[PDB]
Each structure stands twice: as structure tokens, then as C-alpha cells.
């Protein structure tokens, strides 16, 4: 398989959550949500993330409630049977930009922008790949590359021809905390947020892992010592042979 067909290898960035003892940077998850909302959400859904899950992770209960209520959801029909709407609540799932697949394709030149709830785990390369893709669109495709109309060149994408154009540009977002919204900063932030969307158990899983490996390592070492003691009599056992007198 050629390099182009495989796609350019995504390099290893120093994600602060890489490492057995590292949690996600929650300030980054928070900014990442803003990038998702102000940029990605126009074409990408996040169907598996319930509003309630952001609480105590990237936002307060109050902030999430206000965010949920900005959207309308189907409610139970009235006493006449007529359909009605209601503001979103914590139990609702973050809504997508399109009502159906046909509408999504119609707004993206026949292409279907995938749900991003599991994108980090659904791609080889994980965070490194997502980040590299978002920051790897060159101004022009390499010489000799025939790019189909409506398509864009990105070396990190298998085949190099991708239906999504570059969307991150410096300062397109104004971060609440004052962080400079460079393309790489935004890409770093959405990727962290998206990693959390894919693995919300991340921080707790690693914490339990520390408890589990410590207890098991001790149990393993203890069992070896206990085994040696129980076997000490057999291991040091001695035999002597004295050929019996010929008579039987």
C-alpha cells in the first residue's frame, strides 16, 4: 500500500492525559466544548453525550441547565393530541444539526459528517490523529495530485482526499478565560473534549487502576513467598539408595 493510501503517520504530541497517572486537563475540556459548539456543531452531532454528564466535569449544573434550555425537544402531546415542544433539560442528549442523514448529506456535498461522540476511539491514532487532521490542511495539494471538485487535501487522511475542509483559523473563537485562540490551541482543546466524550470514565478508570495494580502486585509477590514456604519441605527433600539384599 502506498504512503498516500495509508495516510501520513500522526506524530506523538505530549497530551497531558497520556500516562497511567494522568487525568484529563478539565480547563481544556471546557474550552474544547466551546470549539465544538461554535465550530464543529454546525455539521457534527454528539448524540451519545447527555447534558448531565458535563456537570462537574467542564461546567456547573447552572451553566449546563442554561445550555440545555437553548434547544427545543419534543414533549408529550397536549390533551388534544397536538404535538408540542419544550426546552431541553439535563436528562436530554446534546442535539445534532441535522434532522436526518439525507439533510446532512445535502448540506455537505453528498458527504456525511460522522457523529463525534466516539471519534477518538474509532480512529487509529486517537488524539494524535484528530489533532493532526485538524491542523494538517496545506494551502495547496502536492504537485500532481488530482483532487475531485468539492474535495480537500489532507495528508493525514487515508487517500489524502477528504470531504471536510479546514475549519480552524486563528481567533475564530474568543475563549472565556483569555487563552489565545490559535488554530493549534483550538485543535488541542476540541480533541481533549472529544477524548472525554469518548471515554468519560477516563479519570476514574485510571484511579481505580492504580488501586487494582498495587493490590494485585502485592498479592502476586505474597503468593510467591507463601508458595515457597509450603514447598520448602519437598524442595529440600533428600533421597538415598541402598541396594536391597537379593531375597524375595
Amino acid at each position: 500500500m502506498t504512503a498516500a493510501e495509508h495516510g501520513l503517520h500522526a506524530p506523538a504530541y505530549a497530551w497531558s492525559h497520556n500516562g497511567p497517572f494522568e487525568t484529563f486537563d478539565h480547563a481544556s475540556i471546557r474550552r474544547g466544548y466551546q470549539v465544538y459548539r461554535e465550530v464543529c456543531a454546525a455539521c457534527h452531532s454528539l448524540d451519545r453525550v447527555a447534558w448531565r454528564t458535563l456537570v462537574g466535569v467542564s461546567h456547573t449544573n447552572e451553566e449546563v441547565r442554561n445550555m440545555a434550555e437553548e434547544f427545543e425537544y419534543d414533549d408529550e402531546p397536549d390533551e388534544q393530541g397536538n404535538p408540542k415542544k419544550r426546552p431541553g433539560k439535563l436528562s436530554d442528549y446534546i442535539p445534532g444539526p441535522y434532522p436526518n442523514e439525507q439533510a446532512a448529506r445535502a448540506a455537505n456535498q453528498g458527504a456525511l459528517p460522522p457523529d463525534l461522540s466516539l471519534i477518538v476511539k474509532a480512529r487509529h491514532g486517537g488524539c494524535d490523529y484528530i489533532f493532526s487532521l485538524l491542523t494538517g490542511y496545506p494551502d495547496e495539494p502536492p504537485a500532481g495530485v488530482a483532487l475531485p471538485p468539492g474535495s480537500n487535501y489532507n495528508p493525514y487522511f487515508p487517500g489524502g482526499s477528504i470531504a471536510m475542509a479546514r475549519v480552524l483559523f486563528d481567533d475564530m473563537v474568543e475563549y472565556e478565560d483569555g487563552t489565545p485562540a490559535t488554530t493549534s490551541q483550538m485543535a488541542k482543546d476540541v480533541t481533549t473534549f472529544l477524548n472525554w466524550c469518548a471515554e468519560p470514565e477516563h479519570d476514574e478508570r485510571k484511579r481505580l487502576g492504580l488501586k487494582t495494580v498495587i493490590i494485585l502486585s502485592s498479592l502476586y509477590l505474597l503468593s510467591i513467598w507463601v508458595k515457597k514456604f509450603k514447598w520448602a519441605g519437598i524442595k529440600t527433600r533428600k533421597f538415598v539408595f541402598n541396594p536391597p539384599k537379593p531375597r524375595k
Partner: protein, 93 residues
């Protein structure tokens, strides 16, 4: 109980081995022995038994296969690179 078929192993008291005589065994209680205060250092010269005596039976076959793999992998990489285009068309079609 129903009559069962003969095998090559019995049970305690009639294990099925030959009659034993002339052999005397001795053992000492684990409680009377040194509390395993000689794991390393004392068992380092004995260690590598499965290495020095067994490593070649494992190493040679492993080396043969690894090099066979590396050789084929480097060739595949060459074939799909710009420089390998002519040979690819030759061996592929």
C-alpha cells in the same frame, strides 16, 4: 459400585508404580528452615538455566523467522515506493 476399566494410575496405597525398596527419603519442616532469606544472589548462578541451555533452540528459529519477516517487509516497502513502481508492475501483474 459398577466395575470400572483399568488405567495406568491408581490412588494412595496402590498408585500403580513398581514395588519400592532400598530408597530412604529425609525432609525437614518448612518452619525449621531459613525464612527464604536467600532468593537472589544465591539463586542467580543457577538462574538462566532455561536460557544458557535452552536459548539456542528458541533463538535460532526466532532469528530465522524475524529476519525472514524483516526481509519481506523491507521489500514490500520498496515495491510501493516511487522507486519500486517498475518492479511492482512486474511482480504484481
Amino acid at each position: 459400585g459398577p466395575p470400572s476399566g483399568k488405567t495406568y494410575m491408581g490412588w494412595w496405597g496402590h498408585m500403580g508404580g513398581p514395588k519400592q525398596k532400598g530408597i530412604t527419603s529425609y525432609a525437614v519442616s518448612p518452619y525449621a528452615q531459613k525464612p527464604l532469606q536467600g532468593i537472589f544472589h544465591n539463586a542467580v548462578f543457577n538462574s538462566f538455566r532455561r536460557f544458557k541451555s535452552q536459548f539456542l533452540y528458541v533463538l535460532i528459529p526466532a532469528g530465522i523467522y524475524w529476519y525472514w519477516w524483516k526481509n519481506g517487509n523491507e521489500y514490500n516497502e520498496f515495491l510501493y515506493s516511487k522507486a519500486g513502481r517498475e518492479e511492482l508492475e512486474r511482480v504484481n501483474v
